[PDB]
Design an enzyme around this catalytic site. Sequence first.
Site, PDB file in Angstrom:
ATOM      1  CE  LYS A  29       3.038 -31.824   1.080  1.00  0.00           C
ATOM      2  NZ  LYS A  29       3.172 -31.887   2.324  1.00  0.00           N
ATOM      3  CG  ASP A 139       6.247 -33.518 -19.512  1.00  0.00           C
ATOM      4  OD1 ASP A 139       7.342 -32.985 -18.387  1.00  0.00           O
ATOM      5  OD2 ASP A 139       7.018 -34.440 -19.614  1.00  0.00           O
TER       6      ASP A 139
END
Length: 293
Positions: A29, A139
């Site tokens: 988060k 990525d």
Amino acid sequence: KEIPEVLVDPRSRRRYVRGRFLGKGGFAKCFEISDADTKEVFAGKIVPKSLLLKPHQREKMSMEISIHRSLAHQHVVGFHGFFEDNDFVFVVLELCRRRSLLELHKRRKALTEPEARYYLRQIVLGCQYLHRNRVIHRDLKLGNLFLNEDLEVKIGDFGLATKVEYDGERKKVLCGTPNYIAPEVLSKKGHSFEVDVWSIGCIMYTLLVGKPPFETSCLKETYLRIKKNEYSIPKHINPVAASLIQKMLQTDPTARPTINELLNDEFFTSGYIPARLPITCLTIPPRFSIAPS
Ligand SMILES: C=C[C@@]1(F)CN(C2CCCC2)c2nc(Nc3ccc(C(=O)NN4CCN(C)CC4)cc3OC)ncc2N(C)C1=O
Ligand SMILES: [Zn+2]
């Protein structure tokens, strides 16, 4: 198991007031966090240890930190520190106030060719740096190319990044699901740096075409197409651009440009590259006028 209002690093004696929720990247988060002394604002990546019960998952976090802590470049997300308590891992990263190239693409779809040049050049400069330091990112996607206040690209998320330890090493395994996954990874027969040149190829396509090169309803049908090289570039794409995409999106890894070849490509050298973009470029296509009215 709730996250602290203040994040205290006992080693460095630093305290960060947890600011506003930015969103939930992966297990983590993310919050704006501000140092209590300097008041300097940062991006805090907070991951709960309850999701890191397995050594395998712990090790991926450790490697991300290991790799990202060792990087310093203008087009790489600043790594400013990490620490943990019994419940959380906290990573202090460069706040990128204009989010990522993903949010830009959602708003603008296909960019103007100069905008693409502007961004792709920075994507390549940071990626040249990673490769120089033997790091493959693995990525590279629009969500991982962050933008600071001046619309400079900062390469982020090193959770799939791997370090090449010896000349000619082929990584056998990629534990993760990259967005622009190269065919040598999907075939599962080894890969190195040329994986990042593939993704850059896909990013360039997406920036210019306004949608990704192999997109379908089904994720496996998409993987089918990447293997088969099943894609086509629209006619409205300028030949010099389309040529460079074609070079980068070759199934053969060895047949693609290296990261240090790219900026010498005609696409960059014989086209207009803005020195900088105006903030309106987030919303409105720039025309790049020679003078105001
Ligand atoms: C720990 C940082 C992070 F891990 C993650 N990202 C993003 C990716 C998704 C989560 C944050 C970074 N973001 C940001 N900045 C911002 C992200 C989202 C919003 C923003 O406007 N958020 N909104 C979204 C819509 N919500 C309803 C309100 C919050 C605003 C941001 O900056 C003010 N900076 C750096 C990072 N980096 C590099 C990271 O590595
Ligand atoms: Zn795994």
